[PDB]
Symmetry: C3
Subunit: 570 residues, 3 copies
């Protein structure tokens, strides 16, 4: 006895833990993002039709590409079926059983595990939710319910009915029965036997193929455009009624569940067996900076290495996401994927308000927990060397590798006033008291960090990062949080890997540091391995900036090239 049930996701959303539930990113052919599960857009598929077919694209993809278990099923991502013996849970106005979020109790009480689902499907042909009555909604019957639909047009359903009549004359009585009935299964959520699934699939999609030739939309909006999926809900009933009229059919109606709070529990998988994982975070307004950075990474990439680039994007435009991927198209050793950074607000929480993008670095050990090591780099940078050699630096059981922050070194030396929830104090005292660093001199800059993810997973560093995030607001936000949590667990990278470009004036601050540090800064400027445009004067704005040619070099011959001229003509 084998069961495989598929859940349809369109954004980062919690996954069920049972191995028999397979999540699918439906409509992935139209998405530039990853959500942590395979898409419906591999092999023989109709993923691009998801705006119109809805979850039928998952149905189609499983039908054409999956090795079918003895039972094949489909559920929504926040709406599932109750497979447990207790079918007496409190239901509401719509007949659904509500549960706050997807947790271990949710999967236990609703029987969302292999053992409970297997006993529920024992000698049953089809499992599905309870019928819903159209007479309460004011409709006379199921046919009239389609016609009165706010976003429905009966001519589309009439066209589908004629096709069933022509292609399958033996269904005419089943069509009449459903259309004149006052109830039915208004759902695409079911579990049915392998042989019934194949027969229904061949039957349903033969009708839908002809339906595409028989109807034409008339300025349909997003809801009306789902006409195909809406029609398939009626065909589902016509098909079942025909099976019941022919002979036996054992149907088990189950309760429906609803999850009121969306969460995210997934993770990104590596795309190569061995690669240099590079993590960048920016919104649409910094997409130009991210393009130059990614182009700089490609230009200094080792031909014999692979590069797994993941952008934690905050509403980057579809155009910019397309342009960014197009930078990697000619390079099979360079992958670029996008993840909605805003999923981090609902992973383990601080119920105060905070920006997922502002604190994105804190979530690297969780999202990338399947990686051994990962290199984060600020988006306002360009590299002058292979980022892969950062992966070769021996880390031991240190949590991170990073560059010592010489700007903070100046803040401590010159008694710059800090600002946080603990008041206002010199930066040196702030580092010792608030950040609990016995040596404030070990403060590292967060513009480039090699995460020892494997060690963070063993120590559950992520839970500590969240705890520190909850406790108070810090002067330099996640940079302060990571300096506190990673203290005495930091490998120090040479200054060549994080060279400040100096803003408009580089001679005002750095020459007044410790002489040895100033010498290290002067030597690093002469052969940088990464240039950090940290500050107010960005190269995509003024041109009158140190290392400005290094930025232009990587933005020339990209779609952002002509943007820089207008964006610079103040």
């Amino acid at each position: 006895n084998s069961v495989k049930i598929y859940t349809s996701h369109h954004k980062p959303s919690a996954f069920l833990n049972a191995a028999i539930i397979k999540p699918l990113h439906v409509g992935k052919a139209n998405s530039c993002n990853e959500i942590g599960c395979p898409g419906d857009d591999t092999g023989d598929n109709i993923s691009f039709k998801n705006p119109f077919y809805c979850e039928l694209t998952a149905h189609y993809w499983v039908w054409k590409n999956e090795e079918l278990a003895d039972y094949v099923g489909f559920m929504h991502y926040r709406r599932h079926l109750n497979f447990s013996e207790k079918q007496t849970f409190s239901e509401d106005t719509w007949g659904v059983v509500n549960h706050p979020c997807i947790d271990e109790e949710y999967e236990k009480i609703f029987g969302l595990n292999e053992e409970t689902i297997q006993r529920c499907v024992e000698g049953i042909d089809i499992l599905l939710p309870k019928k819903w009555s159209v007479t309460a909604a004011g409709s006379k019957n199921n046919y009239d319910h389609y016609e009165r639909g706010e976003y429905l047009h009966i001519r589309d359903y009439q066209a589908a009915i004629a096709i069933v009549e022509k292609l399958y004359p033996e269904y005419s009585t089943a069509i009449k029965t459903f259309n004149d009935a006052s109830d039915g299964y208004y759902t695409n959520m079911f579990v049915m036997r392998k042989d019934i699934f194949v027969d229904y699939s061949e039957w349903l999609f033969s009708i839908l193929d002809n339906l595409e030739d028989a109807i034409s939309m008339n300025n349909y909006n997003a809801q009306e455009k789902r006409v195909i999926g809406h029609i398939a809900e009626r065909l589902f009933n016509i098909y079942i009624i025909k099976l019941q009229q022919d002979g036996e059919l054992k149907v088990k109606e189950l309760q429906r569940t609803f999850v009121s709070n969306e969460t995210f529990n997934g993770a990104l998988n590596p795309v190569f067996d061995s690669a240099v994982p590079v993590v960048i975070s920016f919104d649409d307004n910094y997409a130009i900076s991210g393009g130059a950075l990614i182009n700089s990474i490609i230009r200094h990439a080792d031909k014999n290495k692979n590069y797994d680039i993941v952008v934690l994007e905050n509403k980057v435009s579809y155009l910019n996401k397309t342009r960014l991927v197009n930078l990697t198209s000619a390079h099979p050793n360079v992958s670029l994927r996008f993840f909605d950074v805003n999923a981090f607000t609902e992973i383990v929480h601080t119920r105060a308000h905070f920006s997922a993008s502002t604190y994105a670095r804190l979530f690297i050990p969780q999202l990338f927990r399947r990686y051994d090591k990962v290199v984060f780099i600020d988006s306002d940078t360009v590299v002058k060397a292979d980022l892969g050699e950062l992966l070769d630096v021996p880390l031991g059981n240190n949590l991170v590798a990073a560059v010592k922050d010489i700007v903070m070194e100046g803040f401590v030396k010159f008694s710059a006033m800090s600002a946080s929830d603990d008041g206002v104090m010199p930066a040196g005292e702030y580092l010792q008291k608030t950040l609990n660093m016995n040596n404030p001199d070990e403060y590292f800059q967060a513009g480039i960090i090699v995460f020892n993810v494997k060690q963070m997973v063993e120590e559950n560093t992520f839970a500590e990062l969240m705890r520190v995030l909850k406790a108070k607001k810090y002067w330099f936000l996640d940079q302060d949080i990571m300096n506190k949590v990673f203290y005495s667990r930091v490998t120090f990278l040479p200054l060549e890997w994080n060279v400040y470009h100096g803003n408009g004036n580089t001679d005002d601050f750095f020459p007044n540091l410790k002489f040895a540090t100033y010498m290290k800064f002067l030597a690093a400027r002469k052969k940088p391995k990464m240039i950090h445009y940290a500050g107010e004067n960005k190269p995509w704005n003024t041109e009158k900036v140190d290392f400005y040619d290094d930025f232009i070099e990587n933005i020339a011959n990209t779609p952002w090239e002509m943007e820089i001229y207008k964006r610079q003509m103040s």
Copy 2:
């Protein structure tokens, strides 16, 4: 007995049918165009001096590079010699025999064939036109005729006379005879014996070489600049008179002909043994679009294939033609040639007025009749794939391969009013009645067409295209003409080969088509093989356009790159 006579052409112009007449494109080194015959600019040549030497560049090229027949001759492209027995044809005020155009009767009555020319040259040393008298023009003698010339300066002829005297003292009496005579052969049109041709060539060009050192032009205009050719007309007489004074010389004076109506009957020959012939048509204002297209063709070209690109140009600037060829300079497998599209107005005519560029596609089976198959593509496109795979599509005896026009599909479905000489009617009725298409749904788009030229040659499809062009004016011009003539002889290419970019709004028209067609349009947009910027909003104008990066990608790093910025700053 062998005869080879060469005709000098500088633009598309009719060729004589006899195999012994060899057409030459004189001054081809200064031209960017092909006219359908070899140039005077291969091997040892002086083609660039054609503005000054005139037809002497053809003389020089034959002298240095051709295997000389027993008789070598030269004629103009619309002025020839009468080799027939009848030398009594009606002549006019200037002593020329006029004939409307070059046809089969013209070549028959004036003996322009191998048999008649061979009997005319039997025991003759030199054949040439009748002498012309300078006394009727008001001149005292041949010397005075040069001095009184409107665009002549006697100091140039005096310089040439001194050179003949110094280099060839034995010519002094022949110089005096001609200069004091009142008549002579004012022509460069002759047929002479192989040995006389070589001797005259060595003699004439030895003088002209020294003449270049002895004269200097003084702000000469185009007519004055022909001083070398004008002087050679006098030297021709001095040379002949010397031969007659030394001993025997048998001269046969023939009548001159003139062709009052210029036509074109040539064809372009393949430049590779096997290649992908690509035909594009545009004027100078669309040269930027053509550059992006040609660059896109190069960028997606197969290294193991050859590409024979021919641009039917309508007064494209010399600068733009140079820039376009320079796109192919680094690619020995890509050829680019230009042909004046305006020659199509005088090929088989509709004596109404029409634009050669507007109807250029109709003339492809005639100009390219020596090709088996040819791919036409609109100039407002860019390709995303190798155009060579269009040549691999099985055509059978179909006349063309093209993409079904989904815009016309919408016009028929939505009863768009047509406009032609047959009035105003719905597009569906217009397609059935005016275009005689039993199924209006097979209407194909003309933005990319694989011509089965070999089949069109066998069926003489070109004559039918011209007949249909004469009959009436059509709603979509040559697209309608080709849909009518090619009906039921069309292989349908997948929509990926002609993807509309959608202008500024792509959601207004296409979603209201047949649902199956809209799905095909959505799938084709996701991986286009050719992008068609058909419509009002062109990417070289607004930037705010779908597939705009695909156009910029191919115009970047070309001489038109900075043009796009000023042309877009409205």
Copy 3:
């Protein structure tokens, strides 16, 4: 007995002739220029610290990288030590012996040769200048002299004293002796024994290493920034006093010299064993033109050849010099070096005023006297071919190879009025009388010249060029000087190697030349090997210029690309 003494140079400056004196370009890591000697920036070095360590960078470099002779010494570039027996030369207010310039008498009287220096160091441990008294300057002792220093801060010297005390407790009495003394060796100029040099080096730089950690500058200016070098002058005395207190030490105090007139006598050495030496000259305002030229040279370079490019720069910006070198970074067969052209004013002089850049070509046989042949090219050019084939042209004992000047050919033919110190006369008479050219037609253009340097060295052509430069001012400056001196010693290059772009109007002047010359000009324009943008309308200014695309082609995808748009938007 072995002696090696090093002199510190920071700009083009005269070198001592004795083989035992080794010149060093100190701080070369911060310079983009060559001055004719090795730098302090190879191997283990601190060259970038030269703004702070001063000549200690030469000391450090010799210590870490040189095979030390029995005696190691250091002198300034215009201040040396008197090694001769006579130590009684007239000294001035500061105790230095002045000499006008570095000549053979200077090296003789002050014993700056191997023989005199060897006898001076016979049984001596350390040689150095006379002590200087701080009491005359108003100081109480050597400690107080540091504190009262205008650009000195005693806290820095106090920090160095504490380090000597901690690291070397045995020096406390030597520290007290020097600090309380009223005199000492305020110098970094010395010669000492090999073993004393190593011990002092390990001692001095161990202190300076710790000093970098113990001090921090406070908005120091250029003079204050030399704190390290200033402190080392005191440590030098502390170290010597300790050696004298421990036991024996034989010290020989020598007189100091000063050279009041700076000269230059060096030469550039080849960087490859075999290469194409290319010499260009421009200031910062023509750096854009030089970038396009150098890029054109790279684009047409033979992969199997090396290219030794030297720019005689006249205050080209640091940014532009960096951008120019960056053009060669991806090309290991192309070297780019810079030399300050202004050193030519002090090589052999005309004590009138003249511009080193205006007459830079005249100095090629002197600066490049170690090359066999050298190709000069104007900066307002782009090449269309490998410059290396100019080196293959047989020169014999001719002094130069160049292109005949057809513009001067027109000036002579049209009696253009010359202008020089000899008055105003037709150009033909000027060429014969002032330039002493029996045939004015052999006048060559100076925009591209192959110098036969080896022949010029044998004939001392440079001395003649200088003599002619002194005598009078010429119409076309160094072009006239070189035409006079190189007359009848010129190999004539084909016109394809120096094609005028024609300014805005090319049809006004050239068609009126000798006809043969005009034909040569028309043929050269059709396939140029070098395009000369000589004149008023430069391609980086107007766009409306012949061969404009040839210039843009080489400036596109460089940092000057966006400069051209603003510089052209008038």
